[PDB]
Each structure stands twice: as C-alpha cells, then as structure tokens.
Write a protein that binds this ligand. Structure first.
Ligand SMILES: Cn1nc(-c2cccc(-n3ncc4cc(C(C)(C)C)cc(F)c4c3=O)c2CO)cc(Nc2ccc(C(=O)N3CCOCC3)cn2)c1=O
Length: 263
C-alpha cells in the first residue's frame, strides 16, 4: 500500500484498457508510472486481492510493481517507469536502425521474463509488443501480466470481441477457450515476428476473423526479412497445432542463446 501523499502527477503517458497512466515521482525522489484506474473498467476487489500475489513477482525483465493505492477511488497502480514506452511504437521508429543482434536481445529479454512467469505457473494472457515496455537502456520488460483477468469490457474479454488479441492467440483459445502455458508460447512466437518485422501488424492484410480461419487451417506467418532461418525456426516452433508439442520458455531461452552464439 503506497500512501498517495507520497505521489506527484507530472506528465500523461497515454491511455490503456484501464484509462490514463501518468509519470510522476514517489517520495520526491523515484520515477514511477501511475495507472489511474477508470471507474467501471476493472474488477477491483478481485484485483486488490491478486495484487498481494503480484507484489511477489520480481524479475529484472518484468516491469516492477511498487505498490497500489486502494483506500480511495480511483485505485492507483504504481510501477517502474520505462522511459522509452511501449515496444510496439519503439520498433516502428526507423531512426533506431536496429541490428539483428539487438532484435534477438529484445526476444531474449522477453523470454527471460516469461520463463520466470512460467516457473511461477503465472499466465500473461496478452503477451504482444504493445504490452512490453522499453527502459532508458533499451532493455525490454514485460508489462501488465495477469491483468486481463480483471478487465470488465466484453469487447476485450470475449474471443470474438473487437479488442480480443486474436492475432496473438492459438487455435485452441479461439475455438475452445483453452488457455494454458502453451497459449502464452504461441503469443511469444507472434511477438518475435513483430520484433523481426519492425512492428508490422501480424497477418497485416487480414481481418481478425480471417486470421482465425487462416491459422485453424494450418497456415502461419511468413518469415520476416530480418529473421535468419534459425530465428524463424524458433518463432515457428511456437505455433505447432498441438499445444503439447510447443516448447517451454526454458527451452526457447536455450534456443535463443544458441542462436545468439551462432550469429
Ligand atoms: C509503466 N509504464 N506504463 C505505460 C503505459 C501507458 C499507457 C498505457 C499502458 N498500458 N499498456 C498496456 C496495457 C494492457 C492491459 C491489458 C489488461 C489489456 C493487458 C492493461 C493495461 F492497464 C495496460 C496499460 O495501462 C502502459 C503500460 O502499462 C507507459 C510507460 N512509459 C512511457 C514512457 C514514454 C512514453 C512516451 O510518451 N514516449 C514518447 C515517444 O517516445 C517513446 C516514449 C510513454 N510511456 C511506463 O513506464
């Protein structure tokens, strides 16, 4: 529990599923981001109970939760501040002129975070470049893990809703609501595709509805130009039609390290 007397509100950082997020300082010293949870957007009591478990998730590649303000409304969520914002927009800025080793290191950052979540049996459920952030050193960290469970908007939570992450979801989620570790694995493969494509929309010439068909029929994202055969094999291995034949994040991490050594 953070005391809101110890916060300031300095600049807007944009809006997400729960409303506005601000940059400010905590204790007059520490940079933070502050989610101000919009009324009606969150299952607040459930989140408050889960925040207790989320306070114990800590890894260098996970955005760090500093605390919450829950003796008031709106509730606030206080985290690590990530100076370069979301990965998706960062990827899309041509000035960065990334080398492919830098792209692979972004995949590795995310894979490390995801291996830690997997070790805790904790699903993200919306892993995608829009839900990763980049700090002032260029390190990518996974954000907003587990928070999909508290979203009240049916357009997000329904698998045929307009906001559901269709292009990041495996067939068994879209058809049956079968969420598992292996559904985050599928999304991670799509995220590597986003990274190697410099932030293109997956299935860029298809709708959500056409994507769900394409993939249920066995077809897959093409190799981005910047991806070697070895990198494409890694992302592609995340998309096996049999969930149980997809790798774990531990295996992915070893594969990524091997390719880094090879390249
Ligand atoms: C910690 N933090 N947070 C956000 C932030 C802000 C708005 C929304 C969200 N967001 N994103 C996804 C999401 C998903 C869900 C589910 C439930 C759908 C998964 C639930 C949610 F609450 C959310 C959610 O709030 C976040 C990330 O949390 C943004 C941060 N930093 C910056 C820094 C710079 C700039 C910028 O302006 N620039 C200018 C151009 O150069 C680059 C930098 C912008 N932001 C930050 O440090």
């Amino acid at each position: 529990e953070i005391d809101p007397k110890d916060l300031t509100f300095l600049k807007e950082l944009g809006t997400g599923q729960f409303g506005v997020v601000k940059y400010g300082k905590w204790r007059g010293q520490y940079d933070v981001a502050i989610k101000m949870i919009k009324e009606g957007s969150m299952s607040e009591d459930e989140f408050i109970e889960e925040a207790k478990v989320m306070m114990n998730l800590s890894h260098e590649k996970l955005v760090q939760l500093y605390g919450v303000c829950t003796k008031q409304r709106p509730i606030f969520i206080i985290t690590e501040y990530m100076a370069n914002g979301c990965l998706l927009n960062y990827l899309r800025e041509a000035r960065h002129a990334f080398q492919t080793q830098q792209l692979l290191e972004m995949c590795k950052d995310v894979c490390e975070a995801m291996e830690y979540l997997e070790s805790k049996q904790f699903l993200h459920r919306d892993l995608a470049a829009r839900n990763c952030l980049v700090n002032d050193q260029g390190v990518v960290k996974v954000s907003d893990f587990g928070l999909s469970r508290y979203v009240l908007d049916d357009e997000y939570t329904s698998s045929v809703g307009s906001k559901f992450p269709v292009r990041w979801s495996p067939p068994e989620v879209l058809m049956y609501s079968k969420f598992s570790s292996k559904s985050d694995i599928w999304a991670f493969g799509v995220l590597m595709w986003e990274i190697y494509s410099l932030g293109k929309m997956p299935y860029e010439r298809f709708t959500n509805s056409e994507t769900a068909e394409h993939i249920a029929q066995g077809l897959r994202l093409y190799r981005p130009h910047l991806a070697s055969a070895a990198v494409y094999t890694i992302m592609y291995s995340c998309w096996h039609e049999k969930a149980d034949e997809r790798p774990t994040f531990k295996i992915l991490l070893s594969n990524i390290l091997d390719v880094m050594d090879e390249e």
